[PDB]
Each structure stands twice: as structure tokens, then as C-alpha cells.
Subunit: 41 residues, 3 copies
């Protein structure tokens, strides 16, 4: 059950591209915007 990280002011989702670059996109269906958040411990 992944989560999305959305900029509240711009509507953009955080994306990590395969090449390691990070940017924003408004395509909610892009699988590269899905995250798992877990404790470091």
C-alpha cells in the first residue's frame, strides 16, 4: 500500500526516475511516484 508525496501548493508528485534524478510530475498514474516510507530502525 504505497503512498504519494504531493506538493500541496503546486499539485506535483515527487518522482524518482530510473537514472536517479528526482523531479515533479502531475501524472498520478506514473509508477515512479509510489513510495514506501519505513523507520530507519
Amino acid at each position: 500500500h504505497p503512498v504519494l508525496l504531493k506538493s500541496t501548493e503546486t499539485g506535483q508528485y515527487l518522482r524518482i526516475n530510473p537514472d536517479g534524478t528526482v523531479d515533479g510530475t502531475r501524472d498520478r498514474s506514473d509508477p515512479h511516484i509510489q513510495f514506501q516510507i519505513s523507520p530507519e530502525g
Copy 2:
């Protein structure tokens, strides 16, 4: 009622920011509206 959150680097103290042009960087300006995030389930 909304519940915006901030995402802060433990190493550098910088908050994640998405800029209108789609670029992503970090800032220590806690008042920058661009550092506010909504986290929600994809489902």
C-alpha cells in the same frame, strides 16, 4: 481538515521542495509554502 507535512533531511537540515517548474531541491526556509506535502495512499 488538511494535514500538510514537511520532509526534513536529518543530515543537512534542509526541507524537500518541489518548484513550479518541476525541479526538486532543498531549502532551510521553513516558511516556504513549496515545502508543504500531502502524503496519501495511492489506493
Copy 3:
């Protein structure tokens, strides 16, 4: 309470580097992949 933000599609963790740049990495040992999540208010 530090957390990791991992892309499900590529296995990369979000990172803010010493110089402030944001990228993805699979280096689990880099302390730069640790984040704190807090309420804006």
C-alpha cells in the same frame, strides 16, 4: 524519528546530498537518505 522514502518501482531512496542536491540512491548506508516527517503546524 528518522524514516526512509523508497521508490517502489526502482528501489531507490530519496536523498539530499551534502551540497543540497536531491537525487535517488540504492546506498542504504548513506545517512543522507534519512528524513524526519513533521506537521507544518
